[PDB]
């Protein structure tokens, strides 16, 4: 039915996992395993294990509480998915298949930026894959719209090819797909339904995204076989709405509590109530990183 599912902090831009987290807490049911013990692909800082200093078990308990747990579980989910996604050569080839995949991503990406900036390829659903392989993607554009190429890194894959979808998978399986997988685990870094499908996929996660003004279905995982609580949140700026039911209603309402409570903290804040609403601030107006004011109110335990 139309509902009006509740509304998620969008702060670390891990609004998606805020949701998926709440999920997993308001039904009680289990956090995937080794999510306090993976080792993340990320090579600049993993904000993971910065946090794994202060929690080892599915211990989270603030003595200073719904709203507190999602977001921290949102840093560890950032990286723990994509970890889940590298070894994985099924998703690593299921994902250049379909109407959708990587081949119909690149094909379009192609004849479509002899019109279009790449800014304005980088808001569609596939911003984080354009991103990630923008190097390749550039040096297969003009490659093929213009007659003499810079003798670099990515000719191997093209010189002996039969297609230009023999390119794409020589590139997929030797280094894409890695970087693609490296890409969607760093902060600030948006998922569209793209990711998430191949994310609720590979961990067989039931799952409806409807849109807030139709109700009409967008993207959609479905295995019966598999019986778990009803997932299903809305949306189009990036931003989630969790569908209420009737386990989740009276505890999402208690997280709803919260949130208009750090609304308001947070405009306070440039004697306030609530332990994390510093660190969720924008960046620039109080501190430089927002994360190091989560782990300085988490050393007081």
């Not at 600049?44 to 719904?66: G, T």
């Not at 279009?116 to 554009?141: D, H, P, V």
């Amino acid at each position: 039915r139309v509902e009006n599912a509740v509304d998620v902090s969008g702060a670390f831009d891990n609004c998606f996992f805020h949701n998926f987290a709440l999920y997993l807490l308001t039904n009680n049911l289990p956090l995937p395993d080794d999510l306090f013990h993976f080792k993340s692909i990320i090579n600049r800082n993993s904000k993971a294990e910065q946090l794994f200093e202060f929690f080892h078990n599915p211990s989270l308990n603030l003595f200073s509480y719904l709203f507190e747990k999602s977001l921290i579980l949102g840093f560890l989910l950032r990286e723990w998915f994509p970890t889940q996604l590298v070894n994985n050569s099924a998703v690593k080839a299921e994902m250049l298949e379909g109407e959708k995949g990587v081949f119909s991503a690149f094909k379009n990406y192609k004849e479509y930026r002899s019109f279009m900036s790449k800014e304005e390829l980088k808001s569609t659903e596939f911003g984080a894959l354009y991103e990630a392989n923008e190097a390749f993607l550039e040096y297969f554009y003009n490659r093929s719209e213009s007659t003499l190429i810079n003798k670099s890194p990515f000719e191997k894959y093209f010189v002996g090819s039969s297609s230009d979808e023999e390119a794409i998978k020589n590139y997929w399986d030797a280094e894409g797909y890695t970087l693609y997988c490296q890409h969607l685990a760093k902060p600030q870094v948006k998922l569209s339904y793209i990711e998430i499908m191949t994310m609720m996929k590979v961990i067989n996660q039931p799952l409806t995204i409807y849109d807030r003004s139709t109700s009409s279905i967008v993207a959609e995982y479905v295995n019966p076989k598999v019986n778990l609580p009803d997932f299903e949140v809305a949306i189009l700026q990036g931003h989630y709405f969790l569908l209420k039911t009737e386990e989740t209603e009276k505890e999402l309402e208690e997280y709803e509590r919260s949130y208009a409570q750090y609304k308001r903290d947070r405009s306070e804040i440039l004697p306030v109530s609530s332990l994390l609403v510093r660190a969720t601030c924008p960046k620039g107006h109080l501190d430089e990183d927002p994360f190091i004011a989560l782990i300085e109110s988490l050393s007081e335990i």
